[PDB]
Amino acid sequence: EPDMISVFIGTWNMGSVPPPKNVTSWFTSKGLGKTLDEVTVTIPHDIYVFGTQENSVGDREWLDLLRGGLKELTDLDYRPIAMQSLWNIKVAVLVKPEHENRISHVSTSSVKTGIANTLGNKGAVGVSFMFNGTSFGFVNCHLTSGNEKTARRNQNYLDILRLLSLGDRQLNAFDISLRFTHLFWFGDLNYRLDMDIQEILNYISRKEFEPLLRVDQLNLEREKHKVFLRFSEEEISFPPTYRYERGSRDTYAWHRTNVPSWCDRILWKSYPETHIICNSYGCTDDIVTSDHSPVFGTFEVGVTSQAYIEFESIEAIVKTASRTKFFIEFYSTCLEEYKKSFENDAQSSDNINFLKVQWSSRQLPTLKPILADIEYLQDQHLLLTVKSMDGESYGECVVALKSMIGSTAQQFLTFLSHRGEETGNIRGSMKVRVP
């Protein structure tokens, strides 16, 4: 029935002590940054997702605290659809009672990413599900600490990306960056500021965040295309959330030392031509039990209620030295089974590192969707993987059917990726024809 839903994401490193009794500000996006402080009448969200780190409250008691807090806030009995914990890294997903019958295909997963000669218990936990016909993944993580450990954090990220098993077994050809309509990845990512302490404190007291954001390690690693390929993060207008003295937010704790940093982050990655708007991204300033401040993010998200596809041609530019033949596998929830193309019938290159690979219409199968309703087909997506004939994918991508419905073929162009690396691009011409 609903066209759109409101999704809340919270991330909080709790610093190994229990929460204060009142965490209302976290739930309602009140504090610093892009906030919902103007809102006078709380509009309860459809889904609340809580990711925590250094959470030393027993699992049952923690879930009870959250459910109890939401009950008091909303007067609704929110339904925990899933929880997953790995050491003190814990995620929970709660939904309005009315939505319980809209949820299906729930899975959870965890991944350990321990590095020698460092403090352990790092990794990630995840939950995925369907809300009617739209799929969601949520990843909560705690990555390697330390100013000098950027490379370790990047490897943690890649290991989580590769090993987290959320979602359908058939989507094994893809990693979690392409398994869901909407993927939220958050946690104590532990990336720091490349600047000395007194200089950082100066900019924080001036509320001049741009010079700090320029030396944020996460931003810098994303710019290098090493992590979070084509994810989004809302603009940061709140002060660094680590490391505070407990009992107030007036003073940062300090021993390059453990400099104040945006450790705690929310990013997202969505299928093309979908509706998602970020309505808040911020931190609280009245929750003072931990050396981190809680971070909130909220999102309005489109949801879709639970014929043939013909290509004129496909051309891929693939980052590879191989000169063999290639084919494509096509997957989608709108297909009864996955389909495969024939060998490419043309290829060329004037670059030792790249290859242009082409499939004419003849080399490409028509795909048959399970339902011919225009409104159904508009919300669907195709997942493509480019494979060699000898056989391991060279690149995956997603293509939206939204603008392709009709009699004449339409252009598409998108990026190929594999294991967190950009591996080229793919383009073509296709249509989704209904009788």
Author numbering: 420 to 674, 682 to 732, 746 to 830, 832 to 875
Question: Which statements did the authors publish about this structure?
Answer:
The SHIP Ptase domain belongs to a family of Mg2+-dependent inositol phosphatases with specificity for 5 P dephosphorylation of inositol rings. Here, we report the crystal structure of SHIP2 containing the 5-Ptase and a C2 domain (Ptase-C2), revealing that the two domains tightly associate via an extensive interface.
Each of the eight molecules (A-H) contains a 5-Ptase and a C2 domain. The overall structure of the Ptase domain in Ptase-C2 is similar to the one previously reported, displaying a central β-sheet sandwich decorated by seven helices (α1-α7) and several loops (L1-L4). Importantly, a loop proximal to the active site, spanning residues 674–684 (L4), was in previous Ptase structures disordered or closed over the active site (hereafter referred to as L4-in conformation), whereas in our structure 6 of the Ptase-C2 monomers (A, B, C, E, F, G) exhibit a conformation where L4 points away from the active site (L4-out). These L4-out conformations are stabilized by interactions of R682 in L4 with one or two aspartic acids (D613/D615) adjacent to helix α5 (hereafter referred to as singly or doubly bound L4-out conformations). In molecule D, R682 is half way between the L4-in and L4-out conformation and in monomer H R682 is disordered. Together, these conformations suggest extensive mobility of L4 with a displacement of the guanidinium group of the R682 side chain by ~20 Å between L4-in and L4-out conformations. The interface is constituted largely of hydrophobic interactions, with A592, F593, L597, Y697 and P698 in the Ptase and Y770, H820, L822, E836, V838 and A840 in the C2 domain forming a hydrophobic core.
